[PDB]
Write a protein that binds this ligand. Structure first.
Ligand SMILES: [Zn+2]
Ligand SMILES: [Zn+2]
Lengths: 149, 76, 137, 72
């Protein structure tokens, strides 16, 4: 079986889910999590349901969870393939952080886009240049990609 | 005109500039003093980044002002 | 047991870095395909063979079971080689040991290198080839 | 060796105990009486095995990110 840590995090995630976040292990791989983040209220993504996958690499928790959007989203820190620029996923990882905190941080990222530390440079420039329009695009994309999906 | 540029080490050089000198001119004169290609240089004065085409005086840089040289990254 | 999508993103990074002398290369066919299904491959025909210096373009498809199941490979560039269909370019899995006996530790890189290795075999090495540049339809 | 630096700047010892408890943030088990623990300069506490894995790769406490070499 698994490290007891992974069993404990999983029991606690299933028994006490993060609000706005569905997260459950794969029937056949307890290290793989099917995730759905609801677009935050008062964000361009409101009404959206965003699919995400999370994977615990064999070195976890000494290595960060791998996470990616599987739903297309217009956001300065998410690229075309759904990869996520978030400091705790890379150089600010600590093994005292949990899946719960990775999930909360991504949710919070949706509510608080960071164009100044871009992954998606086009989206970021548009977020700086013309925020209003960048927000309306994010809205349209929510409707296009993140509704009945 | 005389200005100090300061790296993260705390090494400070000194340059002969003019207030009508553009950022490119400096970056070029940091290069011939330190050997750093201009496309690797990011100069900062009082919190704000200093873009290439522009001039010294635009950012209100005056005699014995201190600029901060850090590396110009690919983007993160 | 291997999560497909994360496996493919590692193959994309390695793809963009390039490996060795650059005799094999691969990347996404569409850089917005979040399924990471459709890939391109290049192989440079190896020396001391009729393939030598020719640039072969290939399509590689990593289906939903990848890498538990092997990918499908097709040559776009016309080639005479054991196990390549002459009207479609499709590669017969049975004829390529890596694909015939696929392991979930294999990759697009491994497939491409193996095809290049097979170009040097006694059966293929002196096969007459069609003119350079030509493709199937 | 990275391990000489760990011993230099931290305090390894055996845990003293016996509902107002202390857990290891790395493995999520209670620190139990007799277990080998390591306290860092920031005063944070871990199972020695657990945090020794991390401090091989990093010089920073998992909880507060304070470098184990830090002074003043
Ligand atoms: Zn522990
Ligand atoms: Zn600490």
């Amino acid at each position: 079986g698994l490290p007891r840590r992974i069993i404990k995090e999983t029991q606690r995630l299933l028994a006490e889910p993060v609000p706005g976040i569905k997260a459950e292990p794969d029937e056949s791989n307890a290290r793989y999590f099917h995730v759905v983040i609801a677009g935050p209220q008062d964000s361009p993504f409101e009404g959206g349901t965003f699919k995400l996958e999370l994977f615990l690499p064999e070195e976890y928790p000494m290595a960060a969870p791998k996470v990616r959007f599987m739903t297309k989203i217009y956001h300065p820190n998410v690229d075309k393939l759904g990869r996520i620029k978030l400091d705790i996923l890379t150089d600010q990882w600590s093994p005292a952080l949990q899946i719960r905190t990775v999930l909360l941080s991504i949710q919070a990222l949706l509510s608080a886009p960071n164009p100044d530390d871009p992954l998606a440079n086009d989206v970021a420039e548009q977020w700086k240049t013309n925020e209003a329009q960048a927000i309306e695009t994010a809205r349209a994309w929510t409707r296009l990609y993140a509704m009945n999906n | 005109m005389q200005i100090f540029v300061k790296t993260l080490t705390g090494k400070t050089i000194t340059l002969e500039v003019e207030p009508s000198d553009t950022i490119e001119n400096v970056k070029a004169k940091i290069q011939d003093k330190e050997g750093i290609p201009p496309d690797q240089q990011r100069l900062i004065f009082a919190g704000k980044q200093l873009e290439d085409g522009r001039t010294l005086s635009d950012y209100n840089i005056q005699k014995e002002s201190t600029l901060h040289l850090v590396l110009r990254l690919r983007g993160g | 047991k291997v999560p497909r999508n994360f496996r493919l993103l590692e193959e994309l990074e390695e793809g963009q870095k390039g490996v060795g002398d650059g005799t094999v290369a691969w990347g996404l066919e569409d850089d917005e395909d979040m399924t990471l299904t459709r890939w391109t491959g290049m192989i440079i025909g190896p020396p001391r063979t009729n393939y030598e210096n020719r640039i072969y373009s290939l399509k590689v498809e990593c289906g939903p079971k990848y890498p538990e199941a092997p990918p499908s490979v097709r040559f776009v560039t016309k080639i005479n080689m054991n196990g390549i269909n002459n009207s479609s370019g499709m590669v017969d899995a049975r004829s390529i040991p890596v694909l015939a006996k696929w392991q979930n530790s294999y990759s697009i890189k491994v497939v491409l290198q193996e095809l290049r290795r097979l170009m040097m075999s006694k059966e293929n090495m002196k096969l007459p080839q069609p003119p350079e540049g030509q493709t199937y339809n | 060796a990275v391990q000489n630096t760990i011993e230099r700047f931290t305090f390894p010892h055996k845990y003293k105990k016996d509902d107002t408890d202390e857990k290891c943030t790395i493995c999520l088990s209670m620190l139990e009486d007799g277990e080998d623990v390591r306290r860092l300069p920031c005063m944070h506490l871990f199972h020695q095995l657990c945090v020794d894995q991390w401090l091989a790769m990093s010089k920073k406490c998992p909880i507060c990110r304070v470098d184990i070499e830090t002074q003043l």
